[PDB]
Amino acid sequence: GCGELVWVGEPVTLRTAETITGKYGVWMRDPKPVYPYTQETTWRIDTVGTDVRQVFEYDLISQFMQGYPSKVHILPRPLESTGAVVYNGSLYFQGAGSRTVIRYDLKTETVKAEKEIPGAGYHGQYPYSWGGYTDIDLAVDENGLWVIYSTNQAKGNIVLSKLNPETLEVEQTWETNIRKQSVANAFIICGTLYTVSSYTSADATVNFAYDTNTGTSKYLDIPFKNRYKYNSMIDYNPLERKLFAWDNGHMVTYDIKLSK
Ligand SMILES: [Ca+2]
Ligand code: NA
C-alpha cells in the first residue's frame, strides 16, 4: 500500500562502527531477496578510504548487530561513496573514479552488467551537500531500481532514471528542478523522490517531493533528525518500509508513515 510520506520517526541505532574506516558507509538488506538469501540477510560496507573493496555479509540479523560476518565479498572494482543498494540478489555500486554502475551478483560473485549513467557527473561534480563523491545514488522502491544523479544538461538539478535491474539499461529519465548539491541526500518512495535538507543540522526536514507520475515538485516540512550530526547515507527499503541510514559511524533505521 503506497502513499505520501507524512512522518519520519526517531533514528534507531542497530550497530556502531568501531573501525577507523566506518564514519561513512552503506548498509542494506534486499527488498526482493533471492535464494539462498532471505529478507533477514544484511550487507555492510565501510566506505572511508581508498580502494574500498570489502563487503560484509550477514545471514542473520543477530550476526549483523554483533559484527561477525558469515561471508566477506571482495569487489571486482573499487567502490565509490555511499550510494550503493542490494536488489534481486545483486549489489549495485559505482566504480571508483567513474560514472559506471556495476551489477555484482552476490551468490556467484561475478559481474552481470556494467553501464555508464549517461552524462552523469562523478567524483565531486554533483555530490550531495556534504561532498564525499556522492554524485551517484542508487535507489530501490516498490517499482524497482533507480539511479539519482545530475548532468551538465540538467545544470546540476537532480535527475532520476529508471533502470532495467538486469541489463542496467536506462528505461526512462526525469529532470527535476531541485539542485542536487543543495540537499543532503534523497530517496524514492512509491515513485516519488524525497530530499533531506541537511546532513548535520538539528532542524533538518524532508523539504521536497518530486512525483515521477506527474512530473511535479512540491514543498514539504517533515522533521528529520540527524542524531549523530553527519548523515552520509539515506535510503528507503520498500519491503520493510523503513529508511536505512549511516550517521557518523552509526547504522540506523527510521520508521515512516505513508498516507493516501
Ligand atoms: Ca539515498
Ligand atoms: Na543509494
The structural domains of the chain, with segments of one domain joined by +, span 1-260
Residue 35 Cα to ligand 2 middle (Å): 23
- Whole-angstrom distance, CA of residue 24 vs CA of residue 127: 15
- Cell digits of residue 21: 574506516
- Whole-angstrom distance, CA of residue 128 vs CA of residue 186: 9
Residue 112 Cα to ligand 1 middle (Å): 23
- Whole-angstrom distance, CA of residue 219 vs CA of residue 207: 6
Give the experimental resolution in Å.
Answer: 1.9
- Whole-angstrom distance, CA of residue 153 vs CA of residue 229: 33
For 63, the enclosing helix (H) or strand (E) is helix 61-66
- Cell digits of residue 181: 548539491
Strand-pair category, 52-58 with 71-79: antiparallel
Residue 19 Cα to ligand 1 middle (Å): 23
Alpha helices (runs of H) in 15-165, residue ranges in sequence order = 61-66
Beta bridge partners of 236: 243
- Whole-angstrom distance, CA of residue 122 vs CA of residue 180: 12
Among residues 220, 238, 251, the alpha carbon closest in space to that of 39 is found at 238
Q: Is 113 annotated as a binding residue?
A: no
Q: Is 247 annotated as a binding residue?
A: no
Give every CB contact of residue 163 below 8 A, 6+ residues apart in sequence.
101, 144, 145, 146, 147, 169, 170, 171
Tracing cell 553527519 back to the chain, one arrives at: 230
Residue 63 Cα to ligand 2 middle (Å): 23
Residue 98 has φ and ψ, to the nearest 5°, of: -155, 170
Tell me which DSSP letter residue 95 carries. Answer: B
